[model samples]
Target: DHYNCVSSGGQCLYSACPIFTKIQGTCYRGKAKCCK
Candidate 1:
């Protein structure tokens, strides 16, 4: 499983983070915006 730090309530677009991809979930930094 993989974990990703998704900022600004953004979605994970990469296929690397297994945990994120498996759960189809993304994390929010809570204080930052999505990264480019």
Candidate 2:
């Protein structure tokens, strides 16, 4: 299953989160990262 952080309010990132957003969680079993 995939993580729900993105569905909640975050976005999926490959390398890292941008300066405007912070790392809130991960997705796809940590294969992808999330920021908000």
Candidate 3:
């Protein structure tokens, strides 16, 4: 499946990402919430 977020260059992750980046959207229907 695809997500709108993927169009913006966001990436899905299991662990925490950089504090600088923020959670703008998600992928996998609701699993690994991507941060941009």
Candidate 4:
């Protein structure tokens, strides 16, 4: 949980994330999808 996938965005990255409800799924630690 870090960047917030559903904060202001329209789509949801739940499939790649362990938690669906959570917006940011440890993406901030990565370089690919951590730009959010």
Candidate 5:
């Protein structure tokens, strides 16, 4: 599925931000209580 923030020019901060630290799934589970 396409996310709202995934436009061509739109920055995927989740993928680019150093703070993400390859921790998306973990972070999502921690903050949103969900996993991708």
Candidate 6:
């Protein structure tokens, strides 16, 4: 997002979304719908 670093703890807010991708213990760097 703002930075090319780990965001949302590598978890896509709407993981159920078809475009949502699940992340592991690593960080997620995608521009998807993030959760609050």
Model 3 residue pairs with clashes: none
Clashing pairs in 6: 10-28
TM for candidate 3 is 0.48
Candidate 2 per-residue C-alpha lDDT over 1-36 given as tens digits, one digit per residue, 9 for 90 to 100: 445666767778786887677776776677778777
Off by over 4 Å in 4: 10-28
The top-ranked prediction according to TM-score is 2
**Candidate 3 wrong stretches, greater than 4 Å:** 1-3
Ranking by lDDT: 2, 3, 4, 6, 1, 5
lDDT of 1 by residue, 1-36 (tens): 223434333344433333333333433433222222
Error of 6 at 5 (Å): 13
In model 6, the runs with Cα more than 4 Å from the true position are 2-10, 13-31
lDDT of 4 by residue, 1-36 (tens): 355544665233424534343333445445424223
* Residues 1-36 of candidate 5: C-alpha lDDT, one tens digit per residue: 333322332223334344333322222323321122
Estimated TM-score for each candidate = 0.16, 0.56, 0.48, 0.20, 0.16, 0.16
lDDT by candidate, in order shown: 0.35, 0.72, 0.65, 0.41, 0.30, 0.37
Off by over 4 Å in 1: 1-15, 18-23, 29-36
lDDT by residue for model 3 (1-36), tens: 535555776677765556577766565776776777
Per-structure clash totals for the candidates: 1, 0, 0, 1, 0, 1
Worst 10 residues of 4 by lDDT: 10-19
- All candidates: CA RMSD (Å): 10.3, 2.2, 2.5, 7.7, 8.8, 8.5
Residue 12 CA error for candidate 2 (Å)? 0.7
Residue 7 of candidate 2: its Cα lDDT?
71
lDDT score at residue 23, model 5, on the 0-100 scale: 22
Give the lDDT of residue 33 in candidate 5: 18
